[PDB]
Symmetry: D2
Subunit: 40 residues, 4 copies
Amino acid sequence: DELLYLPVRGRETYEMLLKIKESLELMQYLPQHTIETYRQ
Amino acid sequence: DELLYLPVRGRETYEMLLKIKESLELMQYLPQHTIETYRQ
Amino acid sequence: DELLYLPVRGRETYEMLLKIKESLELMQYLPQHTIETYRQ
Amino acid sequence: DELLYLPVRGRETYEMLLKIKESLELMQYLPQHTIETYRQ
């Protein structure tokens, strides 16, 4: 599952894309059930 | 802390913005320490 | 092409998701060629 | 205005973050007036 590199001009954007990236990656630390109970 | 409504034209976009929204909200279920240990 | 509604808790998030949504929608105002010349 | 580098694990994510990044950068090719007329 590839390690790819995204160049970002602008710290404001970079920090936003970073935010999004992390929160997406950090979701695998939650049980599938929690993520499901959060939706309903 | 306001409840706001974002109208989305397109299911492909909506599902992306949804994805991002959830993963951002679902991060409060993780310890601040986990989020920190994930960064380093 | 559906009009869907995304509820957002938090103005900081809403404004981010809004930003992303707009910039994605506003890209249809550019020529496909511009978007392509921007990539290369 | 810094050039920063965001490493992404996963092509699906990378392509999403790329999408967002581009559409945000590609908005400077539109007149401020267009972006404003799009909002109202």
